[PDB]
DNA sequence: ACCGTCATGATCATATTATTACGCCAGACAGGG
DNA sequence: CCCTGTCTGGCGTCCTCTCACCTATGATCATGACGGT
RNA sequence: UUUGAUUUGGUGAGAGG
């Protein structure tokens, strides 16, 4: 279901901007999880270009130049 | 006959039903409750005496001392209301209490105390109520609002359906005490019976029945009947009453008297019961399998062994029968446990019980209350006697005992406040009866189960909580000191009492700030039945059913006036005729319809007495005697409307206005509006603003005079008489002699309230509306208030409206207004803003208010005087200086020589920086009033001494004029007495006037009266001396103020806001609208007479938003103005009074059987000219709510004027000058300006201040802030492909500080470019997550 | 309430009628003012489950996609195929309904001209590409989404479709509320699916399968009606037959579950003993 | 920070940290003094509950409180909830160069432009006006320009009509549900104090004119002006994204 | 008029108790056929 | 040991505007006013 | 070895859309 599916994501900021932050931050902390940003709300949190709209060319460039 | 202000402008009144009970005093809830609270009340209850006699006498911890109670008394307040609102104090009265200390001796607490002491003691300050029904807490006029909560008593609810997911309903029985521990009996899906106390852990219910010292044999004696088995020579015969066998299938062939009655495999019919009870069958025969599961009642013991044969509440087997049969028992008592009739709920409950006696039950109850501690029999007895059975911790009120006896079908409604054994046993009996299928559950929203608290009861409860804290303190101190040496003011202290009552009146959830911008808004905020607050529900949790109108709100709580939004139906408003019962419920009037005739006696019914009887509807036709003219009449029996016969009715409603409230009974043609639009119309009629010259409603309901006079904005005459001196400040009434006291000679002075600030920044003015030499009657208006006119209620103004689409400028809901409206200065409302400036006390020294100010020149300081404060009258702009104040210097550059002060200049060389505190802008105004308050000790400057001399001079002149005016009335009394009995016609005015007593006159009533007037005169002399000394003391003294403030300067700006595109106007039916274009005069659609229409609405809002009442209001307003134009035509031609009398009489008859029936033949040729002087701007018409003016009456009144019958005039155009096809509707609608203006919402920000913890802009308008680019807007920009717009929308424009300074340099240099960076609030997120044990980082 | 409000608004409502009206309108205001919270929280949950999904390819390179048919509840055909397959790219190439023709190719966007050439040929159902069958890792390819919907063309490489989709489902949350036998209507041809049947003694084709779908196909080829016929019903008609408009074609008794057979013969009571297994209840009012 | 007065309105975290440090100092002193077992067990237990109350308050039994009965807000309550950092300061931010006022109709507009008042226009475009004033040469330092627009002389309105001309703004109605609730217009200056909004566009915003309010936002940088003109312009949103139906239907 | 006594205001660490009245809806837990 | 009531936690709409209200105390040196010589 | 204007926090109640 949609709230169990958005809280079970491979990106803990996406699952922490949404409902309960305690459960998700302890699960991510004891798992040692890492957030390869790669979505819209991680980049709205961290303050950069959205990887969808005009910023999709910027993220193509950055993903190409690694 | 009519009162003299009702011969000024007598309102035309349609309406058919002759009234029998007039509208009561609309503020009776507040005033009657608080009069019930604070008054010397004998016989114990109610009031403060209930608290002082329930918490006292405080007896000590076995020290034989006792602090008992005598009486109480409130002294006068030190400050009256006006000085209290000006200065800022509470409006309180000191509560003196006479307490007594007695101290008993040793070995005889029934012996003599050695010493008593009775004395006066100070405790608390309770705030009094003003005559308007409001409180003044800290200079701001506040209202405590009535609460609607659950009635104390038993309550049998049914948890229907939802539990256990199998449809098996539960039943709980919540006992709701007024003060103490709750008690919930309930069931479970195993059909066991479970008690709980205050929502704690759950126990089986009969554990409390053992706690009341019941043995198990007695419990089964109570909760079941008995079945008798007699062992008489054959198969253990049975006593049988066949009523238990109603529908049961027997296991054998029941025969008796040698006759087969019942066959095996069949059930016992009702006629077989009739056979067995007709033949009087007693003993029948049972098999050995019949008592295989019968449950024994009491214990049987064997006499030989001394053991127990079978325990109580146990099923019987073969061996148990074999044991008790050979022990000598012939009688066997069992229980009847049926499927439908009587379940064994008590029996299964006792089988779940582990306990066996009183002690174990008390131990288990003591253990579920306080978990995990050693119980002791004394502690368990003390706890269970202090839960329910003590006068201290448990108290149903009289309301609680009434509901608890009524819902258990008792007789006496009087009982103790504590419970007993019979009470809990009757609760369990009624719960088992509801589970058995007979009897009904009780709904919650039924208004026989919703009590109304008010100001008096809630203040009593908060005062009682203060008293139980202070009895903790007095029980501490009384037995821990030396006696006798102390007095009962060293023990009791006034801090918790005053803290409790000051916290309740100061900040509660029900002691709220009065919405005061309108007389209607006052008188409908004081009448409010809020469901929220302490003890009630909350907005974001509940619910569905409580937000819905129950069938018993009819005539108690208004169905259509409630705030839409998050709390609909919780902020209910009480109706017009709805009183409050003795206990606290709602009651409403009715007319006792005896068998044929509607008797005109009123008779108050509550919410549960209404259900049993049958009530006729309000507007039922009756022919002059009371006989109902139909033979089917619409009534309502038990919450359900229907059609009943002519003479099975028992009550009729009083008047047809009683379902609605006073907010929504000033709406004309309410029965034509759909209920949503009537709701929005009543709410916006509450939200109006007072204009400059309020006019009148042409189409009212006649309810305006009750709302105006029964509020407190007009100056109602106390004693009638003759006016002597009218002024814009004061009004002097000379009291008539047939209304007048013998002593205290008496001519009254009304000091009006001129231009001062309301709470909503409106302008609460009072204008005198009486002439000079004019008679006034007792109970009559003298000075109109805000939004009043001649004692009526004029909220907005009435304007010429047309319904037509006009070139798109009224597209959705907009309104288009001619410039003729703004030229006449007719919506030009007057607002007043209060600007405060304090002189605080900081380091490097105090502040300066003087005008020797750095960094400023002539152009600023020309508008200040020689001491900083702006003049009274100086018309300022947005951003000038009102009060000059200098201290801001901070620490720009640290003083080189530490604290070098005495060297260069005197004190210092302006520190390091200087900037005279200059103010903002956005508002104009004219400074009308300046207050200066000085903390005592501080040097008064020259303007504070100017204000002190000014107010000394004003108060000196005012008290001297009090003495002169009352002395003039006293000398007029002396002249009136000396007309007869030794009259001197020439000798009276030869001597000075102060000696009118020693003239020739014997010992009569007249020399006695002159001696009494000499007593009054010398009293006025010495009283004037002492009061002028006290008033000089009040002006000359300082005022207690904030910690570390020198002086407070308050300045009142008086803005005059006119009208502009963007304001919100609305009628009285829900037709809202932003006024969209202020056209010139020429563009308006005019008609074939010449007059332009003022406002062009939009027709398309009528068929969807179904408010068809505004079109009938428009047509009847045009009829009213047609009559007014014909009066203006018959008066402008200077016609004699005969033709005016003819036409006014024809315009006042005009209808069916109506109530008005006036005649002008008793107005005597001078009042008719003045009545026509008041009717020439239109004729006011009353239209009551549900008994209004029908269509044919509007047509007949439009035929009296020469207007067209259909109401529609053909209208030309202003632009083209050619006719609009299909003639349009014009008329007058009474439209209101609302105080949602457009130069209070408009705001703009380039770059202002920034918040401190997260570097983002501030929020709001007063703080110069930016609009929240919220989360859904971020989603809406992700939904496009806009990526750079969102990046600068949440990095550059908002948060990143180096990013935004780079941005500002780049914008002022022309390079549109952003250097992004990181949000600083994300670094705040890193510090808050990192401040836990969590290690968040940024890789690479 | 059994007594209506016989008075409109041009005539006056009296007191009781307005009070019943206020019942009906207070319920509506409470429903909107409490419905808006669930509508907003639904939009929040939807844009946070979507949140990631960005059009990131141009073709996933598949041949799978859902089978868009017109939807039919049992009345007249509710939502036509042109509403469901407008602007969505076909999965395999749609055969023209005559015989084996390449009417449209296998990767064409179906705009209005293609949908009109679908409606002229009366095309049955289109196998079209759906977003749930997209093979793209971490995103949705440009063909399996479909038309842009506010642009006439296909979705561009980049445009966030999860957020516009979540907003478009949750945005109408305010307008939504919060709190015998078969009679044919038109006149066409019968077809049966999921059917295993047998002819009874009288002739009415009874069905030995519970899950049988009774379709009414017209003379053109498209499916115009559909119904569900229970196990053991009396069908007045048969397979492939032509009927008249309004003629009853189905009959059953839902209160009596039929235990009808396939063959004939005699009846024996196997493990049916009166006293323990079955019971004797002779009827009262009939005698049989 | 102190509020208006002479006292400091202290935060809740300072109460939490100050209690943990008070208890930790007490526990160090008791382990210095060699108190018995039950004293240091209560002391360490009070420290455990103090730390557990600092981190996530109220997850243990009934939460501690300072004033008056309301519990005080801890670190986890600075993160979680509707008013934490995610939902209140990182997903939604307060925004400079933004404005807000009551809307009204103005049916003379073309549907790519909206009316915008002169007072709001001179406040939202202060840096562009400063840059324009510094380009002409009328003034010198920045102060002079801020005095000029604080006085509002006769020459800054031509400057304002030369910064408006081709510069779109984002109008936004306050409950934005779908993407058609943020649309970009070109301003046309209004004598008045109310945003004039083209009527057809109202059916997209669900905006009637019964007292509604809208916010204006300014695209600062150049890529944002181009995104407002090329993606978010009101001429570009004529079909609703939920379906194929036109959203500029005449109402 | 100077010297001594009662009174009254600054600075400063000490550390937590006597109400109840939402409605689902998952998720984990002791109980028992 | 697989169902099962029962208990515990965790949600519950965005944007805006106005107003008022904000912990007690328990102990002492030193200043400050009052009275005798 | 001497250039600087800078900052108004939780709680609860009520209204508009
Ligand atoms: Zn794909």
Domain that holds residue A64: 2-66
D87–A21 C-beta distance less than 8 A: no
D90–B1319 C-beta distance less than 8 A: yes
Q: Which residues of C are annotated as a binding site for Zn(2+)?
A: 60, 134, 141, 144
In window 525-564 of B, residues with CB < 7 A from nucleic chain E are 535-538, 541-544
For G8, which residue's CA is nearest its C1'?
D3
| C43 Cα to chain A: minimum distance (Å) | 11
Does residue C228 belong to the interface with chain B, where contact is any CB pair within 8 Å? no
Rounded to the nearest angstrom, the distance between the alpha carbon of C147 and the centre of ligand 1 is 14
Q: After which residues are there C–N gaps above 2.5 Å in chain C?
A: 179
Ion ligand 1 residue ranges (Cβ < 5 Å): C 60, 134, 141, 144
CA dist B1167 → B1163, B1172, D68 (Å): 6, 8, 66
Query: What CATH number is associated with residue C200?
Result: 2.40.50.100
Q: For residues D94 and D50, what is the distance between their CA atoms, to the nearest angstrom?
A: 35
DSSP state of C13: P
- Asked, colleague to colleague, whether B713-787 and B828-938+1039-1057 share their fold, the answer is yes
Interface test with D, best of B500, B1246, B1260, B1275 (most D CBs within 10 A): B1246
- Dihedral sign, Cα of residue B1082, residue B1086, residue B1092, residue B1095: negative
Does residue C149 belong to the interface with chain D, where contact is any CB pair within 8 Å? yes
Q: Do residues D248 and D109 lie in contact, with contact meaning Cβ atoms separated by under 8 Å?
A: no
Q: Is the peptide bond before B57 cis (omega within 30 degrees of 0)?
A: yes
Q: Quick one: resolution in A?
A: 4.2
Show the beta-strand stretches assigned E in B430-516.
450-453, 511-513
**At CB < 8 Å, which residues of chain C contact A?**
44-46, 48-49, 51-52, 54, 56, 138, 157-160, 163
**Protein CA C54 to sugar C1' F15 (Å):** 28
Mutual orientation of helices C15-50 and B675-686 as an angle, nearest 10°? 80
Closest in A6, A51, A53 to C48, CB measured: A6
Q: For residues B797 and C80, what is the distance between their CA atoms, to the nearest angstrom?
A: 57
A22–D86 C-beta distance less than 8 A: no
Q: For residues B1073 and B543, what is the distance between their CA atoms, to the nearest angstrom?
A: 32
Whose tokens are 């501080």? That residue is: B938
DSSP state of B1290: I
B961-966 — which CB contacts under 8 Å span 24+ positions?
B962/B749, B962/B1024, B963/B1020, B963/B1024, B965/B732, B965/B747, B965/B749, B966/B745, B966/B746, B966/B747, B966/B1020
**Protein CA C33 to sugar C1' F1 (Å):** 50
Q: Is the peptide bond before D68 cis (omega within 30 degrees of 0)?
A: yes
In window 33-62 of C, residues with CB < 7 A from nucleic chain F are 33, 36-37, 39-41, 44
Question: Smallest Cα–Cα separation from B777: which of B841, B824, B722?
Answer: B722
Cβ contacts of B1274 on chain A, cutoff 8 Å = 44
Does residue A15 belong to the interface with chain D, where contact is any CB pair within 8 Å? no
Q: How many CB atoms lie within 10 A of CB D88?
A: 18
Q: For residues B187 and B266, what is the distance between their CA atoms, to the nearest angstrom?
A: 33
| Fold of domain B152-224+343-443 | 3.90.1110
Proportion of chain D in helix, strand, coil states, percent, rounded to 5 = 40, 15, 40
Give residues with Cβ within 8 angstroms of D153, minimum separation 6. Answer: none
Query: What CATH number is associated with residue A28?
Result: 1.10.150.390
Give residues with Cβ within 8 angstroms of B232, minimum separation 6. Answer: B283, B330
Domain B575-655 has what CATH class? mainly beta
Closest nucleotide to the alpha carbon of B149, via C1':
E21
Nearest-by-CA chain C residue for B543? C34
The CATH-assigned architecture of domain B939-1038 is Helix non-globular (6.10)
Q: Do residues D168 and D162 lie in contact, with contact meaning Cβ atoms separated by under 8 Å?
A: no
Q: For residues B267 and B254, what is the distance between their CA atoms, to the nearest angstrom?
A: 11
Please give the structure tokens belonging to residue B831.
Answer: 């607002």
Nearest-by-CA chain A residue for B1299? A47
Cβ contacts of A42 on chain B, cutoff 8 Å = none
Residue B499, CB, strand F, below 7 Å: yes
Please give the structure tokens belonging to residue B964.
Answer: 């002169």
Q: For residues D244 and D251, what is the distance between their CA atoms, to the nearest angstrom?
A: 18
Q: For the purposes of burial, counting CB atoms within 10 Å of the CB of B653, is it exposed (0-12), middle (13-18) or buried (19 or more)?
A: buried
Q: Phi first, then psi: what are they for D169, rounded to 5°?
A: -130, 155
Does residue A1 belong to the interface with chain C, where contact is any CB pair within 8 Å? no
B1278–A40 C-beta distance less than 8 A: yes
Does residue C164 belong to the interface with chain D, where contact is any CB pair within 8 Å? yes
Question: Smallest Cα–Cα separation from B735: which of B753, B721, B723?
Answer: B721
| Fold of domain B828-938+1039-1057 | OB fold (Dihydrolipoamide Acetyltransferase, E2P) (2.40.50)
- Dihedral sign, Cα of residue B913, residue B917, residue B920, residue B924: negative
Q: How many CB atoms lie within 10 A of CB B103?
A: 18
Q: Is the peptide bond before B543 cis (omega within 30 degrees of 0)?
A: yes
Interface test with A, best of B1277, B1286, B1295 (most A CBs within 10 A): B1286
Q: For residues B590 and B607, what is the distance between their CA atoms, to the nearest angstrom?
A: 12
| A46 Cα to chain C: minimum distance (Å) | 15
Whose tokens are 């069908």? That residue is: C235
Does residue A46 belong to the interface with chain B, where contact is any CB pair within 8 Å? yes
* Interstrand relation of B699-700 and B1181-1182 (parallel, antiparallel or unpaired): parallel
Nearest-by-CA chain B residue for C168? B1279
Residue B1047, CB, strand E, below 7 Å: no
Interface test with A, best of D56, D88, D90, D229 (most A CBs within 10 A): D90
Q: Do residues B790 and B1084 lie in contact, with contact meaning Cβ atoms separated by under 8 Å?
A: no
Q: How many CB atoms lie within 10 A of CB D225?
A: 20
Q: Quick check: helix, strand or coil at residue B1267?
A: coil
CA dist A65 → A35, A59, B529, C167, D207 (Å): 19, 10, 69, 34, 46
Q: Do residues B286 and B308 lie in contact, with contact meaning Cβ atoms separated by under 8 Å?
A: no
Closest in B1278, B1296, B1329 to A52, CB measured: B1278
DSSP state of B988: G
Q: For residues B542 and C3, what is the distance between their CA atoms, to the nearest angstrom?
A: 31
Does residue D76 belong to the interface with chain A, where contact is any CB pair within 8 Å? yes
Taking the CA atoms of residue B400, residue B406, residue B412 and residue B418 in that order, the dihedral angle to the nearest 10 degrees is: -30
Proportion of chain A in helix, strand, coil states, percent, rounded to 5 = 50, 0, 50
Mutual orientation of helices D142-151 and D126-136 as an angle, nearest 10°? 120
DSSP characters for B200-244? --EEETTHHHHHTT--HHHHHHHHS--EEEE--SSS--EE--GGG
Region of B306 please: left (phi>0), alpha (psi -120 to 50) or beta. Answer: left
**Protein CA B358 to sugar C1' G9 (Å):** 58
Closest in D90, D172, D212 to B1273, CB measured: D172
Interface test with B, best of A22, A30, A47, A54 (most B CBs within 10 A): A47
**Protein CA B1243 to sugar C1' F16 (Å):** 12
Does residue A17 belong to the interface with chain C, where contact is any CB pair within 8 Å? yes
Q: For residues D200 and D177, what is the distance between their CA atoms, to the nearest angstrom?
A: 18
One CATH from 2.40.50.100, 3.90.1170.30, 3.40.1160.10, 3.40.630.10 for B713-787: 2.40.50.100
Mutual orientation of helices C161-170 and C15-50 as an angle, nearest 10°? 170
CB neighbour burial string for C26-46, b if at least 16 within 10 angstroms, e if fewer: bbebbbebbbeeebbebbbbb
| D210 Cα to chain C: minimum distance (Å) | 18
Rounded to the nearest angstrom, the distance between the alpha carbon of A56 and the centre of ligand 1 is 19
- C-alpha A40: how far from chain center: 7
Q: For residues B406 and B397, what is the distance between their CA atoms, to the nearest angstrom?
A: 14
DSSP characters for B12-78? EE---SPPSS----TTHHHHHHHHHHSS---SS-SSHHHHHHHS--EE-SSSSEEEEEEEEEE---S
Q: Quick check: helix, strand or coil at residue C145?
A: helix
For F5, which residue's CA is nearest its C1'?
B164
B840–D105 C-beta distance less than 8 A: no
Give residues with Cβ within 8 angstroms of B644, minimum separation 6. Answer: B614, B632, B633, B634, B635, B637
| Fold of domain B656-712+788-827+1058-1241 | 2.40.270
Whose tokens are 């008054």? That residue is: B39
For G11, which residue's CA is nearest its C1'?
D70
Q: Do residues B932 and B1049 lie in contact, with contact meaning Cβ atoms separated by under 8 Å?
A: yes
Closest nucleotide to the alpha carbon of B1252, via C1':
G7
* Chain E, protein-covered positions (CB within 7 A): 15-17, 19-24, 26-27
Q: For the purposes of burial, counting CB atoms within 10 Å of the CB of B343, is it exposed (0-12), middle (13-18) or buried (19 or more)?
A: middle
What is the count of structural domains for chain A?
A: 1
Q: Do residues B1032 and B952 lie in contact, with contact meaning Cβ atoms separated by under 8 Å?
A: yes
Q: How far apart are the first and last CA of chain B?
A: 96
Rounded to the nearest angstrom, the distance between the alpha carbon of D242 and the centre of ligand 1 is 21
Q: For residues B721 and B740, what is the distance between their CA atoms, to the nearest angstrom?
A: 10
Domain residue ranges in chain B: 25-151+444-574, 152-224+343-443, 225-342, 575-655, 656-712+788-827+1058-1241, 713-787, 828-938+1039-1057, 939-1038, 1256-1340
Domain that holds residue C246: 180-252
């Amino acid at each position: 279901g949609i709230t169990k599916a958005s809280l079970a994501t491979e990106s803990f900021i996406s699952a922490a901007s949404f409902q309960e932050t305690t459960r998700v931050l302890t699960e991510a902390a004891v798992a040692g999880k890492r957030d390869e940003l790669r979505g819209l709300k991680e980049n709205v949190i961290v303050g950069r270009l959205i990887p969808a709209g005009t910023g999709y060319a910027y993220h193509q460039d950055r993903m190409r130049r690694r | 006959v009519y009162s003299y202000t009702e011969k000024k402008r007598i309102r035309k009144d349609f309406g058919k039903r002759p009234q029998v009970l007039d509208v009561p005093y609309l503020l009776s809830i507040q005033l009657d409750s608080f009069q019930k609270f604070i008054e010397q009340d004998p016989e114990g209850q109610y009031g403060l005496e209930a608290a002082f006699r329930s918490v006292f006498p405080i007896q000590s911890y076995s020290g034989n001392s006792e602090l008992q109670y005598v009486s109480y008394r409130l002294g006068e307040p030190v400050f009256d209301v006006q000085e209290c609102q000006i200065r800022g104090v509470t409006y309180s009265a000191p509560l003196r209490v006479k307490l007594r200390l007695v101290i008993y001796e040793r070995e005889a607490p029934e012996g003599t105390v050695k010493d008593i002491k009775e004395q006066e003691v100070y405790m608390g300050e309770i705030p009094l109520m003003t005559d308007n029904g409001t409180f003044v807490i800290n200079g701001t006029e506040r209202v405590i609002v009535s609460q609607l909560h659950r009635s104390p008593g038993v309550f049998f609810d049914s948890d229907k359906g939802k539990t256990h997911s199998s449809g098996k309903v539960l039943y709980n029985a919540r006992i709701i005490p007024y003060r103490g521990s709750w008690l919930d009996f309930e069931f479970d899906p195993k059909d066991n019976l479970f008690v709980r106390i205050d929502r704690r852990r759950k126990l089986p219910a009969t554990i409390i029945l053992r706690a009341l010292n019941y043995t198990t044999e007695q419990i089964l004696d109570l909760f079941f009947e008995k079945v008798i088995f007699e062992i008489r020579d054959n198969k253990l015969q049975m006593e049988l009453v066949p009523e238990r066998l109603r529908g049961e299938t027997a296991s054998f062939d029941i025969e008796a008297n040698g006759k087969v009655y019942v066959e095996k495999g069949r059930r016992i019919t009702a006629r077989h019961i009739r056979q067995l009870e007709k033949d009087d069958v007693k003993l029948i025969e049972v098999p050995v399998e019949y008592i295989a599961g019968k449950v024994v009642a009491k214990d049987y013991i064997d006499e030989s062994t001394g053991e127990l044969i079978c325990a109580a509440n146990m099923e019987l087997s073969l061996d148990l029968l074999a044991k008790l049969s050979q022990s000598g028992h012939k009688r066997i008592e069992t229980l009847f446990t049926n499927d439908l009739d009587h379940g064994p709920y008590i029996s299964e409950t006792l089988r779940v019980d582990p306990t066996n006696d009183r002690l174990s039950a008390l131990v288990e109850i003591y253990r579920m209350m306080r978990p995990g501690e050693p119980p002791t029999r004394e502690a368990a007895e003390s706890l269970f006697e202090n839960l329910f059975f003590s006068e201290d911790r448990y108290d149903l009120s009289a309301v609680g005992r009434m509901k608890f006896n009524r819902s258990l079908l008792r007789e006496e409604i009087e009982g103790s406040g504590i419970l007993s054994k019979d009470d809990i046993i009757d609760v369990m009996k009624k719960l088992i009866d509801i589970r058995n299928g007979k009897g009904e559950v009780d709904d919650i929203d039924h208004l026989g189960n919703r009590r109304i608290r008010s100001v008096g009861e809630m203040a009593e409860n908060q005062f009682r909580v203060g008293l139980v804290r202070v009895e903790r303190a007095v029980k501490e101190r009384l037995s821990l000191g030396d006696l006798d040496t102390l007095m009962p003011q060293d023990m009791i202290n006034a801090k918790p009492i005053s803290a409790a009552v000051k916290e309740f009146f100061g900040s509660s959830q029900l002691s709220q700030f009065m919405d005061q911008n309108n007389p209607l808004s006052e008188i409908t905020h004081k009448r409010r039945i809020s469901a929220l607050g302490p003890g009630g529900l909350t907005r974001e949790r509940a619910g569905f059913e409580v937000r819905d109108v129950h069938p018993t709100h009819y005539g108690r709580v208004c169905p259509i006036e409630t705030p839409e939004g998050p709390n609909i139906g919780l902020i209910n408003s009480l109706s017009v005729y709805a009183q409050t019962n003795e206990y606290g419920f709602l009651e409403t009037p009715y007319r006792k319809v005896t068998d044929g005739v509607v008797t005109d006696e009123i008779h108050y019914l509550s919410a549960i007495e209404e259900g049993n009887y049958v009530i006729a509807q309000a507007n039922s036709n009756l022919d002059e005697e009371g006989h109902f003219v139909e033979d089917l009449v619409t009534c309502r029996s038990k919450g359900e409307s229907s059609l009943f016969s002519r003479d099975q009715v028992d009550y009729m409603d009083v008047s047809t206005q009683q379902v609605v409230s006073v907010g929504a009974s000033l709406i004309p043609f309410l029965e034509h509006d759909d209920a949503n639009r009537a709701l929005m119309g009543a709410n916006m009629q509450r939200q109006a603003v007072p204009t400059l010259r309020a006019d009148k409603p042409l189409v009212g309901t006649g309810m305006e005079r009750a709302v105006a006079v029964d509020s407190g904005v007009t100056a109602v005459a106390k004693r009638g008489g003759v006016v002597q001196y009218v002024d814009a400040s004061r009004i002097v009434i000379k009291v008539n002699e047939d209304e007048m006291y013998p002593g205290e000679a008496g001519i009254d002075i009304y000091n009006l309230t001129k231009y001062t600030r309301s709470n909503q920044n409106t302008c609460i003015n009072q204008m005198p509306c009486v002439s000079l030499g004019e008679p006034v009657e007792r109970g009559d208006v003298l000075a109109d208030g805000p939004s009043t006119d001649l004692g009526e209620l004029a909220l907005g103004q009435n304007m010429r409206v047309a319904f037509m689409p006009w070139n798109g400028y009224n597209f959705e809901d907009s309104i288009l207004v001619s410039e003729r409206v703004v030229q006449e200065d007719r919506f030009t409302t007057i607002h007043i803003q209060e600007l405060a400036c304090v002189s605080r006390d900081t380091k490097l020294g105090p502040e300066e208010i003087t005008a020797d100010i750095p960094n400023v020149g002539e152009a600023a300081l020309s508008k200040l005087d020689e001491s900083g404060i702006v003049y009274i009258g100086a018309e300022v702009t947005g951003g000038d200086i009102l009060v000059g104040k200098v201290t801001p210097k901070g620490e720009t550059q640290l003083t080189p020589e530490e604290k070098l002060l005495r060297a260069i200049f005197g004190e210092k060389a302006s520190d390091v920086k200087d900037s005279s505190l200059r103010v903002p802008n956005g508002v104009s105004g004219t400074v009308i009033d300046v207050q200066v308050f000085t903390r005592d000790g501080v040097e008064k400057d020259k303007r504070a001494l100017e204000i002190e001399e000014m107010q000394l001079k004003q108060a000196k002149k005012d008290l001297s004029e009090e003495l002169q005016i009352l002395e003039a009335g006293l000398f007029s009394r002396i002249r009136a007495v000396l007309v007869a009995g030794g009259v001197e016609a020439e000798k009276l005015d030869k001597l000075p006037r102060d000696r009118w007593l020693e003239l020739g006159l014997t010992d009569e009533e007249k020399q006695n009266q002159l001696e009494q007037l000499a007593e009054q005169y010398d009293e006025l002399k010495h009283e004037f001396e002492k009061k002028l000394e006290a008033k000089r003391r009040k002006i000359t003294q300082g005022d207690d103020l904030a910690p570390g403030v020198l002086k407070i300067v308050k300045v009142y700006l008086a803005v005059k806001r006119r009208i502009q595109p963007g304001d919100k106007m609305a009628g009285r039916h829900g037709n809202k609208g932003v006024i969209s274009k202020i056209n010139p005069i020429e563009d308006m659609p005019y008609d074939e007479n010449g007059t332009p229409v003022d406002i062009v609405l939009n027709p398309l809002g009528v068929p969807s938003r179904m408010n068809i009442g505004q079109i009938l209001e428009t047509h009847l307003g045009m009829a009213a103005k047609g009559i007014g134009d014909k009066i203006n035509a018959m008066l402008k031609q200077q016609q004699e009074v005969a033709k005016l009398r003819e036409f006014i009489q024809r315009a006042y008859d005009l209808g069916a059987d109506v109530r008005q029936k006036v005649d002008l033949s008793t107005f005597s040729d001078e009042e008719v000219m003045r009545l026509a002087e008041n009717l020439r701007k239109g004729m006011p018409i009353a239209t009551p709510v549900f008994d209004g003016a029908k269509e044919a009456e509007i047509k007949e009144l439009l035929k009296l004027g020469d207007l067209p019958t259909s109401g529609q005039i053909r209208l030309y155009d202003g632009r083209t000058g050619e006719q609009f096809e299909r003639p349009v509707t014009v008329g007058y609608m009474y439209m209101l300006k609302l105080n949602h203006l457009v130069d209070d919402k408009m705001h703009a920000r380039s770059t202002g201040s920034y918040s401190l913890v997260t570097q983002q802009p501030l929020g709001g308008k007063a703080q110069f802030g930016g609009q929240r680019f919220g989360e859904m807007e971020v989603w809406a920009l992700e939904a496009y492909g806009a990526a750079y717009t969102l990046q600068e929308m949440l990095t550059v424009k908002s948060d990143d500080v180096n990013g935004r300074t780079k941005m500002y340099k780049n914008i002022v240099d022309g390079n549109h470019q952003m250097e992004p960076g990181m949000p600083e609030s994300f670094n705040v997120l890193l510090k808050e997550i990192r401040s836990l044990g969590i290690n968040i980082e940024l890789e690479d | 309430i059994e007594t209506p409000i016989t008075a409109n608004f041009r005539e006056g409502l009296n007191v009781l009628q307005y009070f019943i009206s206020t019942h009906g309108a207070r319920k509506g205001l409470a429903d909107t003012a409490l419905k808006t919270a669930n509508s907003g929280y639904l939009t929040r949950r939807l844009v946070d489950v979507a949140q990631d999904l960005v059009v990131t390819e141009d073709d996933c390179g598949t041949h799978e996609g859902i089978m868009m048919t017109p939807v039919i509840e049992g009345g007249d055909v509710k939502e036509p195929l042109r509403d469901r397959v407008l602007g969505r790219v076909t999965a395999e190439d749609v055969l023209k309904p005559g015989t084996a023709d390449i009417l449209v190719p296998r990767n064409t966007l179906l705009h209005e001209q293609w949908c009109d050439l679908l409606e002229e040929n009366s095309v049955d159902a289109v196998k079209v590409r759906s977003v749930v069958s997209c093979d793209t890792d971490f995103g949705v390819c440009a063909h399996c989404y479909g038309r842009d919907l506010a642009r006439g063309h296909i979705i561009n490489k980049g445009e966030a479709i999860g957020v516009i989709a979540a907003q478009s489902i949750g945005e109408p949350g305010t307008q939504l509320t919060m709190r015998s036998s078969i009679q044919v209507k038109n006149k066409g041809s019968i077809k049966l699916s999921n059917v295993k049947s047998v002819v009874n003694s009288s002739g009415k084709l009874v069905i030995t399968s519970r899950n049988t779908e009774l379709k009414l196909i017209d003379e053109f080829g498209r499916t115009k009606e559909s119904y569900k016929v229970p196990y053991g019903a009396v069908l007045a008609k048969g397979d492939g037959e032509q009927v008249a408009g309004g003629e009853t074609v189905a009959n059953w008794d839902p209160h009596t579950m039929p235990v009808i057979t396939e063959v004939s013969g005699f009846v024996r009571f196997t493990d049916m003993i009166d006293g323990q297994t079955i019971t004797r209840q002779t009827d009262e009012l009939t005698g049989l | 920070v102190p509020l208006d007065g002479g006292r400091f309105a202290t935060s809740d975290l300072n109460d939490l940290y100050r209690r943990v440090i008070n208890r930790n100092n007490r526990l160090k002193r008791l382990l210095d003094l060699a108190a018995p077992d039950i004293i240091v067990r209560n002391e360490k237990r009070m420290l455990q509950e103090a730390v557990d109350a600092l981190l996530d308050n109220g997850r243990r039994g009934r939460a501690i409180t300072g004033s008056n009965k309301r519990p005080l807000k801890s670190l986890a309550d600075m993160i979680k909830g509707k008013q934490g950092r995610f939902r209140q300061n990182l997903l939604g931010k307060r925004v400079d160069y933004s404005g807000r006022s009551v809307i009204t109709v103005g049916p003379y507009l073309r549907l790519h432009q909206c009316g915008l008042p002169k007072k709001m226009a001179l406040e939202l475009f202060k840096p562009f006006i400063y840059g324009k004033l510094e380009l002409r040469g009328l003034a010198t330092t920045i102060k002079a320009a801020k005095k000029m627009v604080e006085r509002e002389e006769a020459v800054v309105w031509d400057i304002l009509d030369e910064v408006i001309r081709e510069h779109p703004v984002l109008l936004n109605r306050a409950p934005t549900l779908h993407r058609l609730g943020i649309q970009a217009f070109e301003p046309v200056l209004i004598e008045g104090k109310a945003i004039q909004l083209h009527p057809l566009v109202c059916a997209a915003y669900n905006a009637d004119f019964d007292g509604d309010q809208m916010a204006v936002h300014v695209p600062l940088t150049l890529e944002a002006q181009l995104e407002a003109r090329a993606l978010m312009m009101s001429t570009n949103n004529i079909l609703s994204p939920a379906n194929g139906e036109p959203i500029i239907v005449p109402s």
